[PDB]
């Protein structure tokens, strides 16, 4: 089988701008093992039939895992705009994989405030699909070459989510795993009954 008890239950989910890409191959990929996740979790996918993904198979399964708040889990989809889908993690419009997201208020929220999860806020452009940026160069919009220090229009691009248990469903930490299947000229070796 694929290891799905090594992606969905990892103790270390990275922040969104540094999403961890994990290649899974040589399997019998059973997606009926995901019943014992969180009581409500969004299993929506595109380009494959969700009643037939256990019989159609692929050369590789790329799983990307990150943590975002609930207000912006909508942007984890092709053809979406926002902070995440433009500046942090963009899905291509030719997407052939599945987007899985569940609430993680138990694991990722401290009463003092969980500051370990950061998102990119200003980056002077957009992101091409499946491209990350771990760059921490100081953002430049004003007409000052003062990059060593903060200024009027010079900001540090990464900002913190500040997860707390006193916040709405839009601000609760939603751990996201996006499987990204690909079909190529190689033999598949992922499918099985």
């Amino acid at each position, epitope marked *: 089988l694929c*290891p799905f008890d*090594e992606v969905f239950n990892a*103790t270390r989910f990275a922040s969104v701008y540094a999403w961890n890409r994990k290649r899974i191959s040589n399997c019998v990929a059973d997606y009926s093992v995901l019943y014992n996740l969180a009581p409500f979790f969004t299993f929506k996918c595109y380009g494959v039939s969700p009643t037939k993904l256990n019989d159609l198979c692929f050369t590789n399964v790329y799983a990307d895992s990150f943590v975002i708040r609930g207000d912006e889990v909508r942007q984890i989809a092709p053809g979406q705009t926002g902070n995440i889908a433009d500046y942090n993690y963009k899905l291509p419009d030719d997407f052939t994989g599945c987007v899985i997201a569940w609430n993680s208020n138990k694991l990722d929220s*401290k009463v*003092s405030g*969980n500051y*370990n999860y950061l998102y990119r806020l200003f980056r002077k452009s957009n992101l091409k699909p499946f491209e990350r940026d771990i760059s921490t160069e100081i953002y430049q919009a004003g007409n000052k070459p003062c990059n060593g220090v903060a200024g009027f229009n010079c900001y540090f691009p990464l900002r913190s989510y500040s997860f707390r*248990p006193t916040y709405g469903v839009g601000h609760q930490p939603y751990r996201v795993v996006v499987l990204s299947f690909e079909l190529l000229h190689a033999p598949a070796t992922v499918c099985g009954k």
Partner: antibody
Amino acid sequence: VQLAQSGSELRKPGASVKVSCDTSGHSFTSNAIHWVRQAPGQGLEWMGWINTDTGTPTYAQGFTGRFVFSLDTSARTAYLQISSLKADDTAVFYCARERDYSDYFFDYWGQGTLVTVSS
Amino acid sequence: EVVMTQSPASLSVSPGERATLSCRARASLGISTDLAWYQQRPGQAPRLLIYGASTRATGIPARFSGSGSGTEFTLTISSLQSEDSAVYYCQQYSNWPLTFGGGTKVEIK
């Protein structure tokens, strides 16, 4: 790096036992206080963790249904309560607590308490 | 879970020579430097030695160097004293059934 715990119990089969872990001796920044079972001659087994300041337990595979974790009125000391003690259950239950948040290694351990279920 | 097989079963290394501990995982994608090494002296609670694969906890002597990554890790004990005759466990804090190791009972000749 020591946490206070309860003493030993020479309990009987088919009974209930309570195990305390008073971690109110330090200043903290985490919110989890884990439980570890050790057999009298075998290795450590991770039982699960009770979540401080929200009271929600989470158990491992073999330690569900009978073992229950709970907190006391204060938000410091955590309780372990074994229900329906069996014959092969004599063990040294440890109380391990992390140092920092999202650091799932156990820097601060308990002193270990021993149930002695027999007749 | 990740069943963490620890080898060997018992080590008998004379002082102050080198003892090599090995803790091999069963992860298809690897622990990826998320192991923790404990040391349980008999009649005593375990003590956290190394958090992560390499860096040590506070108060630890410099002789307890840890190394390795992925699915094969190593604890090396240099100048193995009489105080180190203890059972050594390894814990993966990678997947949520945080499985401890078997335990290599180090013995002094």
